[PDB]
Structures are given as structure tokens and as C-alpha cells.
A paper describes a structure:
Carotenoid cleavage dioxygenases (CCDs) are non-heme FeII enzymes that catalyze the oxidative cleavage of alkene bonds in carotenoids, stilbenoids, and related compounds. pmcCarotenoid cleavage dioxygenases (CCDs) are a broadly distributed superfamily of enzymes that catalyze the reaction of dioxygen (O2) with carotenoids, stilbenoids, and related redox-active polyenes. These enzymes use a mononuclear non-heme FeII center to activate O2 for reaction with a specific alkene group in the substrate, generating carbonyl-containing products of importance in biological processes such as hormonal signaling and light detection. While one coordination position is occupied by a solvent ligand as demonstrated by several crystallographic and spectroscopic investigations, the other is vacant because of apparent occlusion by a nearby methyl group of a semiconserved, second sphere residue (i.e., Thr/Val/Ile), making CCDs five-coordinate (5C) in their resting FeII states.
To further investigate the contribution of the occluding residue to the CAO1 active site structure, a T151V substitution was introduced at the occluding site, as found in some carotenoid-cleaving CCDs like NdCCD. As this decrease in energy reflects distortion toward trigonal bipyramidal geometry induced by substrate binding, the smaller magnitude of the shift indicates a more limited FeII geometric distortion. Inspection of the piceatannol binding mode in the T151V structure revealed some small but notable differences compared with that of the wildtype enzyme that could be responsible for the different outcomes in iron center distortion. First, the β-ring of piceatannol is rotated ∼7° away from the Val151 side chain as expected based on the less favorable interaction between the piceatannol 3′-hydroxyl group and the non-native Val151 methyl group. As a possible consequence, the piceatannol molecule is shifted away from the iron center by ∼0.13 Å, which reduces steric interactions with the iron-bound solvent. This effect is enhanced by the shift of the iron away from the piceatannol binding site, thereby providing more space for the solvent to bind with less distortion away from planar geometry.
Numbering used by the authors:
A (entry chain A), B (entry chain D): 30 to 526
The structure:
């Protein structure tokens, strides 16, 4: 077999990116300031964190075993529980005590035949009394919210119609449905998209098979009252390239950014309209809604070049690290229009941003608050001379959060400091009567001075001020998505406004 | 109640001394070099590590909750498991989410009434299929060697005759007995010493009650074929002082270092002879044995002033940090002699040393190898300018190990490096046929550059060279004692030479 290294090497596992690989508990975390005593619930987040050194050199960040963190809050106290998802990959590699899975989404490079290749490392959501650890090439892995035990691959009582389940399902706060899809829904290189939904009782509602114009990456999607919307990143899969040991994904400069629109209920596959936005990268969706005219307002991060620059085009053409900025874009779509080309979007702010969150009590409806990561290159905001030698590589960087009020246009910015960077934030309603966007924001910080992680708690009344700073004595490696599960919400999701 | 701080403050919990307080697992530790594939077994060590900030300012290191590390070795791979001893203190404080136990060994300062005050934080030994987590003011806590679950307070099937069990029992490699004692054996301030032993079947053998000349600290003891030996540190307990909120221990410059000698079998309490060594501090015993004449050779660390300087004399007189050195001393005792005063000891080496280990296959018999911690103030060995600002306080420092060959007088020194310090080492026989002192040495390092811990593996053929360096991504706080449990030893202890 290819030799198994016995320690981590390469920039993607250097400095703050070095895997820790701890599972267990740290109770009664140290707190500076004061956690609001009324906060009660759990912040779950997932990070890629390779359990064993890869036999693939410079294995991408996206290919690391999913490790789940839970921060359990009650009466101003907080405990951490941490556990790896017991994926097939995790278990078989742990048994062998060496890496067996090869390149990102390329089964032809695996040292053994896997049934499920999930690292379950992208998102961690709450559904009907379980956590679902998500990875868009795979079904979810179900886990216990209290103990973080892995139950196993989850197929929704045999109802799951797709081989794949998106990392970005949407929770309709009015219908209490989970709205889902999978792309490459029939396997590697397939153009099949399966759109499906589950009612609050767990029974499958929608199931619509449609066909993508290209086998492109559909990382995120959007849901409105009457439509679902599929933006396609111009990364394209060719299985013949994979069989020769090549990358699953390859940028294509010659195609638009397709945006499919399908009626949300009762549709057939042929009802989808593939609108064509200007070539660019479809980033995370903040939210989408239908306005007064019945037009879809789609608000999402959008860049003009390949954010995933390590997967360039066929001639190796693509940007360099730190070059591509994504901006908070508004696209307007009309399902009735027969014109496929879309205009350039309008932009809501100037900041280089990503990882937008809204008050999920208005998801699929008009929202007027968005919280998001920013990366400000203005001199002084980040001490790059100090941070970059300690940072390693392979992961995006955020040096603040921003809160946009869409009505007033006011923006507040939280800057943790010149030697700290942030992950994706969560929003917590102050209580069940709170106005939209009124409550608390939490965000995990990487402190490059201490080489430790911290969890900041902010009040939306003044995002610039930390109300509490929870000081972890270990590093939590840069992660991906996370969610709040409030103790007052029986089904884990907040009540509609 | 006295206010409970919500983060750690003071030098004793600063820098590398900051509690991490993690429990759980890190499998497949990163390894630089190569762990000898024949090594099979577990290195257990214990560290004081406060689970909650104390309400006592500058609480001594010795008063922190015992946290057990196990390093499980097989076929050149190693896993870490880590778990707190579930003492009464740990459990009740965890329930309350605040500190309740007060000053070191002073129940009159506790906020609630404890039955058992153990932090179980001094030593962790193997006996008849269990770990025993030790603290000299208490009975042992029994634990599972595989899972580190705490079973509870252990009383040897109701046979334990004493309130107290030493942190330094000795294992006779020929008789397979565990030889024990407790001081303050009938409660705070008592001069009662209970000497007792257990046969390999778990039945109590010896039980002899004797009386100390003063209520002094007997931290360690020594066992020969025919004698047991009790060196008394001139720290003295007055329960009336304690009732007023004072310290359990107070130095007394006016007394000798008593060394009691009792026949090992069949004795009465009045058979003890209290020899009087020159005033000084009784450090750890390497080993004791009877020579050809039947004289006891007692080899132990010995200092001329109070190593525990934070417990000074009645007028607050004593040394400052880093001032007192201890030296590897040989005392000669003759049980038949009626002369009580002893001569100054001879010294085996000149190094400032402590934490001596021998090949325990010759414990209680003549040994000719000792491994020990050293602290070398020779310029450059430790980069103090770099280390001391990162180190915190409250714990002793070791910047190397030494191996003394007692036949030849040869000394090898292992120096981990200018920005690393060491804990107490363990010795592992190469195999069951290995000569005395031939095999492997392991020692945990504090790396102040990375602010991480490492576990070094050395071959005794060349102690200056690391064969493997196991790289932990977390800190293990400076700890106390540890032990090797070899997989090839049915009762957990090595066979006699
Ligand atoms: O900074 C960004 C911006 C973005 O728009 C998306 C991502 C992550 C996407 C992702 C996609 C597939 C994976 O398997 C995976 O681990 C991660 C990260
Ligand atoms: O550096 C040294 C030298 C020494 O000779 C003894 C000790 C530790 C003694 C000790 C005594 C009682 C306790 O409760 C405890 O945690 C530790 C530490
Ligand atoms: Fe995402
Ligand atoms: Fe000791």
C-alpha cells in the first residue's frame, strides 16, 4: 500500500490547522464576562479534522473526518462535549490504524472499497430528536444530541429516495418541513437532482427528479413559499478523469452560473427552468423570498471567479489564494419569464463576505437582518505578519462579523482583534417574543496569540462588544457549519414570527 | 459562601500550569521516530489539575483534583485515555459547579462536610487487576485499568486497618506482596503510624501500630528483606492551628530527620527504633537493601532545608523558590545499634535531583541502576528567559534525566532541550530476560515552545538519544508519579531477577 505517515505534514495541517483529534468532555468552561443566564440550549458545530495522516499529499481541508462540538448552556454555565462521527471511513481507518480513503470524492483512489465515503464534516442539524451530520456526497449520519453517539447512516425510515443529501437543508418555520435535495443523486458524475421534503411527522412529502444541464456542484439552495432554487457552481465532474486518478471537480470558464427554479409543490422534473446568471461562484445562500410581485429575491454570496482555486480548469487556469472576494448579492428571478439570461445582481454591502445567517424564524420569507463573516484587508485589522506564520493553510479566513439591517442599511461590525479570526456565527432569539434579529450571536474565535479557541457571546443591541468570552484551553481547528438548538423549542427549531 | 471565581487566576494556574481539564481519548498519537514494536503495556500517570477555580487564593499544586493519563502501547502505536478520579470532592463539586473543599488537609476550612477529602492526585499503581489512585491523607480510590472508570474508595475487602494509605507502597518482586503504611493513621494530628501489608492473594498479612516521635510528614518509606524504614520530614502538624484556619504543616528547625526502623515481620510497635539523621528534608526513596553485614543501605533524595518552602516555620522562616537542592544520599542504618544519631550520608552524585526510579525487579534488594530527574543550572541547559514567563509556578522543575550505574559510577544524562522540562520517568525491561536496568525509559516532556506535551521513549543503551517522540497536541499539566504495567505481567508487576 502507499506508506502511512505517522505524523501530520504539509501546510494544511501546520500551525492552527494541526489536528488535535480529541474526543471527550471539558465541563465548566472558563468564562470572562458573564453569559446571559436566560440562554439555554446547545451550539453544535462540525470541523473537518483528519483522524489519521492521509497518504494523499496536501489533502484538502474538505476531506477531513467530521468532529462534532457541542456547547451546552444553562444558567450562565457552559460545558463542551466533542466526538467524531462514526462514519464507515472513520471506523475502518481506526480498525486499520491508517488512512484508506484517498482523494476527495474519488473512489478510484481508495485502498479498499467503501459503501459510504462520507466524512460527515460540513453541517450538523437537528431533526426529530436526532442530529444529522451532513456531507453532500452521502446520506446523513444520525447522532444523539446529548451524548454525540453515532447511530449510523440515516435513510428516514427507508424513505430517502436519493444517494445524496445536501449539507444545506432548509427548515420552514411555518410548515415545520425540512426541505432537501441531493445532486449527483444517482452516483458519481450523474446529472440527476432529487428534490425532496419531509413533514414534521417525518413522512416524505415532495419527491421530484430533475436533470442538471451539466454535472456541476450544487452546494447550497434556496426555498421560498412557492419555489425551490438551485444555483450551480461551474465546477464540473468527469468520471473518466477520476478513473485516471484526477480530480472530481474541474472549473469550466465557458458556462454560466445556472440557477434552476422549480415549483415547490406538485411539480414534475420538466417544470424546472435553468436561468443563466453571469459566470461566477455560487456561495452560501442567506435566504430567498417572494416579494409583492411574486418575484424571487435570492440573497447569497457571489464571486466572479473560482473560490475553490485548488480545483482549476482543464489547463490549470484559476486564481491564487486570497485573491477571490465574494460579495453579498441579490438576484431577481421570475419563474414566469422565458428569458433565461439574468442581469448582474445588485450588492447589499461592499465587504468581502461569506457564511451568512438570518433569523431562521423568517426563513423562506422576507428577512431584514443578516449576520455574516467578513474579511477586511484594510491595514491593521489583522496582524498578518503575526498570524499567517501560525495559521497553516487550506481554510478561509474571517476577521470579523457584520450585522446588516436591510430596512435602514445600518451595519455593525464585530472585530475580535488583530490576532484573532472567526468561524461561522449563530443567532439566538432573546426569547420567544423577541423581534426579528433581536438576541445573541455566538462565534468561535481562533486566538493565534494563545493558539487556543474562544467562544464569543455578543448581544445584537451592540455587536461590537463581547458580553462573554469563553476561553477553551485547546484548539478547535477551523470548521464549517453549526446550529443553535434552543431548549425552549421542543422540535429543536424556533417558532415563526 | 466565599465567591466562586469563573476563570483561573494566580501564578499556580498561569502559563503551562493553566488547567486544561479534558477527559476522553486521543488515539493514534503522532510519532516522530519509531516506537519499539515489542513494547506492550500502559504508562499511567497522575497530575493535580483543579476541575474548578478554588476559593482559596494561591491554592498549592498538591491540592488539585487527580486526573489520570494512560498511554496504551501496542505494535509501535500508542493511544491516550484521560479521566478524572471520581473522588467525593470531584463529584460534589461537579454537582455544585463550584469549589467546596478548602485548604490542603484542613477540613475546618471546607464549605461542606466531607467523609473523604482525597484528591487522589499523587500516585497511580496497579494491584490485583485494578488501579489504585493514591493520596496519603486517604484510602485509595480503585479504578478500571482499561476504561479509567472509578469504582470508588477501596478498603481491601474491609481489611484496611488505617484511615490513611501512603502514596508510595512498595511491591516485593519475590514475595509479590504490597507493603504499605499510613501516618496520621487515626486522624488529623495523630502520631499513629499503621504498618500493613497484603499478600498476592489480597489478604492482609502484617498490621503493626507504632507511634511517631512527632506528628511529622512521612511521604515515602523503604522496605528491605527484613526491615521497613520510615523517614520523617520535619513538617509538623498541630490540629489546634488547623482549627483556627492555619496550615496542616509547619517546619520545625529544632528536630532531626527521624528515620524509624521496624522489623518487617512479626514485630510490635515498641520494636521500632527512631534513629536521628541530621536535620533535613526526606525526599523520595530510590530503594533500600541489606548488605552483607545486615546493615540497611537507604538511598534517597535528601536536602538540608525545607523543600516545601510555602509551609515555613512558626515565625515564617524558610527558603525561597529554587534555593533548596536535594542530593542523592546513602544512609547506613544498623537495627542492632543503640546509638540513635546517624552520620551525615554519603552522596552518590553531585546533581540537584529527585524522583528516583530503579528496576523494580530488584526492589527491596541490592540495585545497581537508578534513573532520576535532575535540575541543572549550568548556563544554557534551560533557556530561563524563554521558559520562566511561560511556566507559571507551584511545581518543581526538571531539565533532564540521569542514569547512574552504581558499579561503574558512570552517568548518562538525557537533556530534552533548552525549552523543554521533564516529569518523573518510568523504566520498562526490554523483555523478561533483560539484565537489570536494560530496556526503555519513558518520560513526559513539557514543550514551552509549542505549549504542548510530548512523551519521549529512550533506550537505556544510549539515554542521550530519543528513539521516539510522541507529540501530544494538548498540554498535560506538570504531574506527580506514574507507573508502567507490562502486558506480559499477569499481576501487573515484573518478575524478580
Ligand atoms: O468558504 C467557503 C465558501 C463556500 O461557498 C463553501 C465552502 C465549503 C463548501 C464545501 C463543499 C463540499 C464539501 O464536501 C465541503 O467539505 C465543503 C466554503
Ligand atoms: O518535588 C517533590 C519532592 C518530594 O520529595 C515530594 C514531593 C511531593 C509530595 C506530596 C506530598 C503530599 C501530597 O498530598 C502531594 O500531592 C505531594 C514533591
Ligand atoms: Fe456550506
Ligand atoms: Fe511522592
Amino acid at each position: 500500500l502507499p506508506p502511512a505517515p505517522r505524523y501530520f505534514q504539509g501546510e494544511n495541517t501546520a500551525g492552527f490547522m494541526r489536528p488535535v483529534r480529541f474526543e471527550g468532555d471539558i465541563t465548566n468552561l472558563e468564562v470572562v464576562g458573564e453569559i446571559p443566564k436566560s440562554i439555554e440550549g446547545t451550539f453544535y458545530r462540525v470541523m473537518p479534522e483528519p483522524h489519521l495522516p492521509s497518504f494523499i499529499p496536501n489533502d484538502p481541508w474538505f476531506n477531513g473526518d467530521g468532529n462534532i462540538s457541542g456547547f451546552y448552556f444553562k444558567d450562565g454555565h457552559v460545558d463542551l462535549k466533542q466526538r467524531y462521527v462514526r462514519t464507515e471511513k472513520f471506523v475502518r481507518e481506526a480498525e486499520a490504524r491508517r488512512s484508506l480513503l484517498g482523494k476527495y470524492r474519488n473512489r478510484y483512489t481508495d485502498l479498499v472499497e467503501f459503501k459510504i465515503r462520507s466524512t460527515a464534516n460540513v453541517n450538523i442539524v437537528y431533526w426529530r430528536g436526532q442530529l444529522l451530520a451532513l456531507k453532500e456526497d452521502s446520506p446523513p449520519y444520525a447522532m444523539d444530541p446529548e451524548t454525540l453517539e453515532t447511530f449510523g447512516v440515516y435513510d428516514f425510515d427507508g424513505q430517502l429516495p436519493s444517494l445524496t443529501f445536501t449539507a444545506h437543508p432548509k427548515f420552514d418555520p411555518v410548515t415545520r418541513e425540512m426541505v432537501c435535495f441531493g445532486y449527483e443523486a444517482k452516483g458519481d458524475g450523474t446529472r440527476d437532482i432529487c428534490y425532496y421534503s419531509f413533514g414534521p411527522d417525518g413522512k416524505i412529502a415532495e419527491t421530484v427528479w430533475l436533470v442538471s444541464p451539466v454535472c456541476g456542484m450544487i452546494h447550497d439552495f434556496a426555498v421560498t413559499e412557492n419555489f425551490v432554487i438551485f444555483p450551480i457552481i461551474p465546477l464540473v465532474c468527469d468520471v473518466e478523469r477520476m478513473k485516471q486518478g484526477g480530480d472530481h471537480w474541474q472549473w469550466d470558464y465557458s458556462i454560466p452560473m445556472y440557477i434552476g427554479v422549480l415549483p415547490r409543490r406538485g411539480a414534475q422534473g420538466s417544470d424546472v427552468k435553468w436561468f443563466e446568471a453571469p459566470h461566477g461562484f455560487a456561495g452560501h445562500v442567506a435566504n430567498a423570498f417572494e416579494d409583492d410581485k411574486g418575484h424571487i429575491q435570492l440573497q447569497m454570496a457571489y464571486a466572479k471567479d473560482n473560490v475553490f482555486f485548488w480545483w482549476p480548469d482543464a489547463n490549470g487556469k484559476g486564481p491564487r489564494p486570497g485573491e477571490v472576494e465574494a460579495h453579498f448579492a441579490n438576484f431577481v428571478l421570475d419563474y414566469q419569464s422565458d428569458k433565461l439570461p439574468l442581469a448582474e445582481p445588485t450588492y447589499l454591502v461592499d465587504d468581502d463576505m461569506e457564511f451568512p445567517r438570518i433569523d431562521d424564524r423568517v426563513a423562506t420569507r422576507k428577512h431584514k437582518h443578516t449576520f455574516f463573516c467578513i474579511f477586511d484587508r484594510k491595514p491593521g485589522v489583522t496582524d498578518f505578519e503575526f498570524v499567517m506564520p501560525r495559521a497553516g493553510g487550506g481554510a478561509p479566513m474571517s476577521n470579523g462579523l457584520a450585522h446588516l439591517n436591510h430596512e435602514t442599511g445600518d451595519i455593525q461590525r464585530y472585530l475580535p482583534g488583530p490576532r484573532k479570526l472567526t468561524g461561522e456565527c449563530i443567532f439566538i432569539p432573546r426569547n420567544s417574543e423577541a423581534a426579528e434579529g433581536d438576541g445573541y450571536v455566538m462565534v468561535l474565535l481562533a486566538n493565534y496569540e494563545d493558539m487556543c479557541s474562544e467562544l464569543a457571546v455578543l448581544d445584537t443591541k451592540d455587536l461590537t462588544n463581547e458580553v462573554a468570552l469563553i476561553k477553551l484551553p485547546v484548539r478547535l481547528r477551523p470548521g464549517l457549519h453549526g446550529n443553535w438548538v434552543d431548549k425552549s423549542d421542543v422540535d429543536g427549531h424556533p417558532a415563526p414570527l
